[PDB]
Symmetry: D2
Subunit: 132 residues, 4 copies
């Protein structure tokens, strides 16, 4: 289940995430869907994606105050961009430090952008945490 790694995120009525003390937004993209391993996360297929200094946050388009999710950058070891040759959309693949299985990873799927600026910003934000 994807909830071992993802946590619930509160938002305003308008779909703005409520961020932690000193947590700052770095980048945002639109119309992103989530995967857990190779499978779509049902009902989390169209949202805005936010990168912060601490987290990747998915804000559900349809029900932002219910279906929004967060992932800690501190739980990640690598991110890898995949450009959409076999997949309909380009994908950003997130690798965890401590997966329960190699089947457990996340993907962000970009339906209205190539996802390149988001992925580049995420690579940098991850590297800042890793190198410390």
């Amino acid at each position: 289940h994807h909830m071992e790694y993802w946590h619930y995120v509160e938002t305003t009525s308008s779909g703005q995430p409520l961020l932690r003390e000193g947590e700052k937004d770095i980048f945002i993209d639109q119309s992103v869907g989530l995967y857990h391993g190779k499978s779509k996360i049902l009902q989390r297929q169209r949202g805005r994606i936010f990168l912060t200094s601490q987290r990747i946050i998915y804000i559900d388009d349809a029900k932002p105050t219910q279906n929004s999710l967060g992932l800690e950058l501190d739980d990640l070891a690598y991110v890898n961009y995949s450009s959409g040759f076999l997949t309909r959309s380009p994908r950003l693949i997130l690798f965890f430090k401590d997966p329960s299985s190699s089947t457990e990873f996340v993907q962000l799927s970009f339906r209205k952008s190539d996802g390149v600026l988001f992925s580049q910003a995420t690579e940098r934000a991850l590297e800042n945490i890793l190198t410390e």
Copy 2:
């Protein structure tokens, strides 16, 4: 930087590695080279690669008692096979649980086989450890 993750492996002159208490031989392949991230590990470009129940072990062809190295399966998180379209040889990429940088990962490069059987065995060996 590769020595953060790999350890020295004692062998014999004929290239037989010293295994641990209860550590079992699973699969071996020949003429493998090692990468650390995108770069070749310089003195480790032609060796046998050995999968055990606990480790991946590189046994150097030219200098086995000196240049042989081991990696704990317990330090890995994911594995990915790449078939060699843009690389001279197929590659098995290994991702650490705890990399100091996301530029640090392992590749095994298969110069005289396709590396499929070795990669499949490693997938299974790693999954046994994770689960």
Copy 3:
């Protein structure tokens, strides 16, 4: 759009394809599905895949005398194996010499094998035609 590139293949009721003058059986794999570009070919999702000296032939499991198709090796330019990290199954991707669009290419999807032996045989069969 896939019917620009694939042709109808006559079989028998037991799923044996009608081969041409001097056309020889090279390799077969089971439980394969077909793609045209990124999309599944709808009635061609479970069949045997057959490499001959001249063609790749899909023999449909459910309706072999109706839904079986052939592709000329002479219409291909490149082949690429993808190991199935993000796809449920490994894929063999085939690139046409003369695509109407660069969105048009073939995939074979291997549901009950890794497709390596079939892919390796196809690489060789295609190279024989090209050279």
Copy 4:
């Protein structure tokens, strides 16, 4: 040999390509190296790359009037972007309509950019020719 597919291109002293009647530049990138199949093209490792309505053109940094090369878009069937996971630089892979072997293809290697805008423009320019 890479010269079955590539042709000589004339330039000005300053390294500006001399274009055909009605041929127009679409995009340019810098610090690109060439591959023929998996191997570097020696001495064609640092140049500007130009996309035109008809061609991809490599302008050699060191000797532009001698070592510049052109490829016809009409000789291509596909282009594929590869994002630099195993390769030091991202790559744009060019597939020919009529290779003599599957070992014969070209790569553009991007040493000072991610090559994304160039690759996107090339995909579009190719598609215009293919669809006719």
